Amino acid sequence: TGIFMHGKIPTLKISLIQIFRAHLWQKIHESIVMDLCQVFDQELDALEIETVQKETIHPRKSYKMNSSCADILLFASYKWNVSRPSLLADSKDVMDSTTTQKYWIDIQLRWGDYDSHDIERYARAKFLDYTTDNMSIYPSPTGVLIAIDLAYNLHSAYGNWFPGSKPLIQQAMAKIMKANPALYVLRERIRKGLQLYSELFSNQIIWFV
Amino acid sequence: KVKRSRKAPPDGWELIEPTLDELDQKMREAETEPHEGKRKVESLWPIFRIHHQKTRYIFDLFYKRKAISRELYEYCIKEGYADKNLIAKWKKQGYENLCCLRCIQTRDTNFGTNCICRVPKSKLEVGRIIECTHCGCR
């Protein structure tokens, strides 16, 4: 998970491999994919959705940074008008684009440094790269490259936007960057290594045998 | 193999022009020939032969037939058409006709530097078998 660095620096290397004990970024990718799946399953018919179609990604699809596969493949309802590719912070969106029937989401994690603060820039860059890259498994042409900076607790996204979902994904990322379980485990491991000590919900009628 | 000499050719070059260019065409054909079929050095056998015949012409024009002028027995050697040292080796009474070095004994070169037809015709080609390693001249 400790994606990369520059120089040898054995101390920080041991520090980072200790900060990630188990397959931890795999856990974060699973957690955030399921968070997006639940946010989609909450309002499915309201967004002209067809079904949560979380695609079988490779087991190291979260650690590999050369390619970019589709984390989830939303099937829209019918004649789903896609807007132009833009950012998440901009409000003047352009709804004059094509109308696709498949909508891909690929969550990326970027353990950034001081010269990697801007997650929006890295996000749109990886978006344009994966889009133009004629080498990756990539079903739908319209989607989003929502990226998360774990080294500064940043969130960004740049891609083709849904009609009436931009604020939905905005609120979902605001509620996922906060109160996330694996994210909390990251924060706890970092506080411990850094030494700076400062089904539950029902409403579904489920049973267990 | 004519490229230039920074001057007009001598008086009677027009007569040697076609015969020289025939041998030059043969040389250009043997120089771009394929290696397939040449065992180790067979590809280098005919080229020396092409160097033989060429001189064997101009020498006959030089002072044998007495047909070439004083210019067309030195100018051809000044530019690359023949070999001066080779002709001088032919000027001797012993080495009348023989290739460069394929059969001679230990000369200044450890393999040979004297001749290729230098095998003695009495006992040359020991028993019956005649062959050479550079020119292949029996």
Binding site: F4, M65, N66, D115, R121, Y122, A125, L128, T132 | -
Partner: protein, 73 residues
């Protein structure tokens, strides 16, 4: 204006001075004009992170001193 280092462990350590809001195409053009090569053969990686020739330079967040592994196509 940014100074980038197209470097390699094979006797090719070039330093190209390129613009801030420039592309990667013109950066490849500079790197090819400087060292020894044409424009369409160069490839600037950073640990298998292939830089494409349509994204911008400041958009990929490169800054003064960033060294990039040169590889020929």
């Amino acid at each position: 204006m940014i100074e980038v280092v197209c470097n390699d462990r094979l006797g090719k350590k070039v330093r190209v001075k390129c613009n801030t809001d420039d592309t990667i195409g013109d950066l490849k053009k500079l790197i090819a004009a400087q060292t020894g090569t044409r424009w369409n053969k160069i490839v600037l990686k950073k640990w298998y992170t292939i830089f494409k020739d349509h994204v911008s330079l400041g958009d990929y967040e490169i800054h003064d001193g960033m060294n990039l592994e040169l590889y020929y196509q």
